[PDB]
């Protein structure tokens, strides 16, 4: 089976500059078997280049392709604000036809620190038999961040869930919410609930906590 | 310009079989070199080609999934039916039907081929749990005076099935900073998300906060009040 | 599957020869059968093919003067070479094409051992034996070499031994080289310590079978 | 007329490492390429069929890939008995066009070593009939590459030398070399001093070994 | 001008053979080229001629069964002899007719070295070696002779030596004579003083190359 | 059919003197006659063209004259390397009639000498298979002419003798001769005494050399 | 060049007997190339035989020829008194065509002694500055004779001239006159002038002299 | 019967050129096989062939003299002209033109060829000295009484050029024994001869002796008196 590896895994470039994407094939096939597709946020993928050098109909001249043997590249000369999406290389060489893992083009910006906020469960959720406390990290760049949960200053692992949102349409920052779910035997068996956050925009990790009893 | 639309059961029970019908317009399954392909994208993963049927009723399937995948065509009704049996919970994905075509030029030189227009896509899930209305728990701004007028407040919609739930803050009069994070599959094959809004602490007790949460498969229309809770 | 060869030798240019390939466990008439030649020191070259139906094809160099045939009665393949020239000196292999369990179409899966064909007017004769003594030095690191030069013979192979096989360690025989005069020569050297130069008398024995030359020549250093 | 080349001409490899050898066609040949292995003194053996299919009975360490104009044969764990010559043959052109590749040789890799360099004169017995052979012998040198030149009173002797090289031994995996000049009686009798200059990777500087006709 | 011959040997009567004449510095097609044969012990006899324009002529004895041709590509002259009979045993010369600086019209100015052609059913075999001792006398003027009789062999030449070449003075080898049985024989004698009859042991060595006979036989007087 | 004869068949000459050899045709051939010289073991060399024209590169001591039916080749100073066989060839008859002459042999002349006359019996070893050879050897006789006859108890043995003669040596310029009788076992075993009679110009009277079967 | 040598150089035979002449050629040519011509005293040569055996027209049967190879002969069976002349052999074999040196046929007779007479110069020749004295030998046979001049009994050489006449028409003898020319410095520097004559008809040479002063 | 006559300059100066014309009658230079040859005879030497011209204007010359000898024919006037250049004193000779012919007989067998009638001959000399009348010196019978009536008396004609001089003794009344020896080329390329008569001493003073010597090229007509001179 032919395996296509894209590079880089993630890519961030502010509008105006040059975008380069690479796709390397495990086996060797004709250069006319490889195409490039672009898929935007929550959209069906659309054809971008076929034959590794033949631009699709209607695609602007900003997209070009160059292929040789087991090395293919997609070049974007002028990249506009509407040109940030995920890019897949796929082959028609051997069955089954396989796509690449993709490459997310990102809108670059200056580094910002995430506001870290904490929200406890409601009385209804103290009534449901399962209580979740949500820890939010907002307005940060880049996407990379780490959060660790502490029940009475004791590290938690395997008992929390994560959800990071997509890039905003106006500020290009990221947001993230992580929930910690427990029962009453755990929620009323301790006092302290804390998030410690490690971000590239923060020189030192920040530990922020709350106590159910005091409030 | 050509279009393709998928339809079928978006709620498929485990170890059962689904049938998906793609109706296409702008072309017919009679032109040489024209085919209909079925591709799937798992949530958060890369694409995976499933099947491809040609104009001369020649069909190709992925060898790792050809034992349980059947593809049929109806040129009269311009339809393509994909039947897939023996479902597993990891088969949940979004399924596209796409137009497949090649480009020869006056000498049969084959300047490549492509998957041109893809269908809108049907999000099909494989699970046992049935529908369930979401439980809404309001998430309270913390006890802070000003903090530079920076705060966030939300509501958590948890234990609902299936996707999706639509959240609106103050009926469109509060959309500045409304983050509706993508819902996460709970450990029990169930869904839970948080919807929050970034607001200034200088307008805590004077600006109303509501979240109208909606879920058609469970017909859940709950207008949950969010209010500041002190100590 | 066994393919046993026969018919090699040495011939004058413009001569003729016949090569035989007796197969077992397969049928020569029922398979694509090829003759493939390889010159000494060069790569493989396809020579001829015969189809199961009797159709034959040849490479361009051997058109006309080479023919391929089969005998069904005893399941043999035959190659008749006529008007042989010097460029035909090679090892010839009988191979079965488009076989193998995964059915390697167009590939040779079963090979014979090949026969040797030589085409030269060398006028078969005997090799002269010349001794080679090292530099007249005392120890020089305890490394001396003595050699037997075997000259002016045709054809190969020849046997070179030291003390009639009593010495076998450190002996290096070099492959014979085709002289511009159509003869062959080689050198068989061996390294011994200088302290053993005197106490161990050495003799180089050259047995050239086709010319029946049994020559044993003494190997001792010289006085300068 | 499908020209077929192999890269590299010869590579030296250790035991157990992965090795890849490439075969290139003058034009695309789809997957009509086969890989054969031939040990010295033996007939070739078919390893890879259709440029990707392993043959029955061939160890799984041999694999083949590629298509069109570029093909590759890859060995994962190069066993000590995998040292042979590998040929790529195409079956694409015509029933009269089954050309073979040049061939790739795989041999054991070891540490560099300096040869013993000896000069052997034309002995009187062979000289008595006007046929003089002079020998420059290089003993136990690795790698195979070496340069030998012939010197006569600072003059350069070229165009009549013969080179005989032994293949790698099973004991020390080195090489041996002999360079021979053949001359008639007066093509040696007049001249005075005869030397051989040698150049090897394992030697920092070329070495000259000279002997006098007059002295011995 | 060089004319190099090739193609001689021995053949059975009624056989065939081809002789080649490779010229240099002249063109075979542009000259009158002749084949002229000479029997061993007899005079020259003109055999065939080919004109510059390709016309050919033959002597009466070889009409029909002899043909002459040329190859322009490599400038050679060819003589194909068929139905060979015993009267064709001779040395054949490739000659250029009507040349020379003063333009010797009708004369042969450039000659090849000639090839030897033998036509007999002698059934090639080996020579027997017989010693010959002189009269049992004391001195008789100090003149005795000892000989080696070489008998019953085909074909020529043979090598006869005394003491493996250690004796070369006074040795007389006589030309071999064609026996009525189709074999060859000769005698190689040498005169030595009688006083050296005893103190000098003698051995006659006969090396017949085509039959590979290497026979050394002792040569000493007898007791009567 | 132009018969062509040479006179004399062979002449003996010294060094430096003038020698003339004549060639005669059965009918007049104008001047279409050529003189060739051939040394033993070599190919003929054209000396004289058109019976009067010296060839280029031929020493001036060779001259040719005559016409019609009589022609002559004359050498002024017969050098030591001029001893060879001389042929006259006509180019008059027809393209299929280039007949050659018999040939004239020129050899060194010296003083007469008597040969050693020896008789060699049929040795027992060769006799053991019924094949007996008896030899009469004449050593160092000049000139070439000699007569040899075979005697058995006054009987005359004729019709089965073989003569082997050596050409003139470069040391003494003499000749050697061997006469051989081959007989089957009983074609010798019954008879008693075997003799050889020899006659030479350098000998006043013929000499008989006899040996007894019974004695040895 | 073909050279024809005749023999003998001189030939004397009284009428009635057999005349034989020989001509030998350096090279060999056909016998039909050689002819014989006869030239009389002060006459143009006339053809005698052509083809070496074919008698010319009008020539009497007394002349015959016989030729073979390089030897030719002319035979005269009956030779008459009018048949004494010079005979040339010539060839038409190779250019240039060459004649023989000739052969003078002589009228034989008995031997006679030459009268020896001396005549001094005239006074006019003592006036001319050069004086010649003439010595005459007459009526002798054969043609061979020798005369030596002596001035005061001293031998003279290189200062005299000779002139012998042809055979007479009636007596077949010969005559000869030899002149000695000197100047006055030589004619009046001596006394004796002598001829000594050696002839086949004289047993001893005869010395006869004169003195200018006495007469 | 055929005739040939030569004409030209009999007095040729050295290193100059002469032209000789042979007029022939009885035949014409048109018959096949007919030629005109020129031969020369030096005084007292053998003949030497000079040139030969054929009926078809084919000419042959002596190779040693072909570089300076030209031969031409005029069939209309029946003439042959020989021009010879670069004269030497040794070229003095008598030149004949002769008829050359061959004899074939009905089968072209060539029964030989010949030089049949020769011309009368022209005596041509090569010298520098011009004409000169002869000097006549009478040669006196010696002082003898009888001597058996045997004596000779003459006159010497010396230093004359060119040939010849005619001597008559007593106007034809004394011809018995008149020897006129052939003239000898003097060392200076000049001519001198003696004319003597054998007479008896018994008629010395009673028989008149005269020699009329004549030389047309010098017009010398001298009637020299010979008389006995005593002591």
Author numbering:
A (entry chain J), G (entry chain L): 1 to 215
B (entry chain I), H (entry chain H): 1 to 231
C (entry chain R), E (entry chain M): 2 to 225
D (entry chain S), F (entry chain N): 1 to 216
Tell me, in the authors' exact words, what the paper reports:
Omicron variant is characterized by significant mutation in its spike (S) protein, which is a major target of vaccines. In particular, the receptor-binding domain (RBD) of the spike protein has undergone more than 15 amino acid substitutions, altering both the transmissibility and its recognition by the immune system. Two bnAbs, L4.65 and L5.34, showed ultrapotent neutralizing activities (IC50 ≤ 10 ng/mL) against almost all the pseudoviruses tested.
To explore the molecular basis of their epitopes, we next determined the cryo-EM structures of these two bnAbs in complexed with S-trimer of prototype (resolution 2.65 Å), Omicron BA.2 (resolution 2.75 Å), and BA.4/5 (resolution 2.85 Å), respectively. The epitopes of L5.34 harbor more mutations in Omicron BA.2 (D405N, K417N, S477N, T478K, E484A, Q493R, N501Y, and Y505H) and BA.4/5 (D405N, K417N, S477N, T478K, E484A, F486V, N501Y, and Y505H), compared with the epitopes of L4.65 (N440K and 498R) in both Omicron sub-variants. We demonstrate that the binding affinity of RBD-2-directed mAb L5.34 to RBD of Omicron BA.2 or BA.4/5 strains has a huge reduction (1–2 orders of magnitude) compared with that to prototype RBD. However, despite this reduction, the binding affinity (KD of 1.67E−10 M and 4.07E−10 M to bind BA.2 and BA.4/5, respectively) remains relatively high.
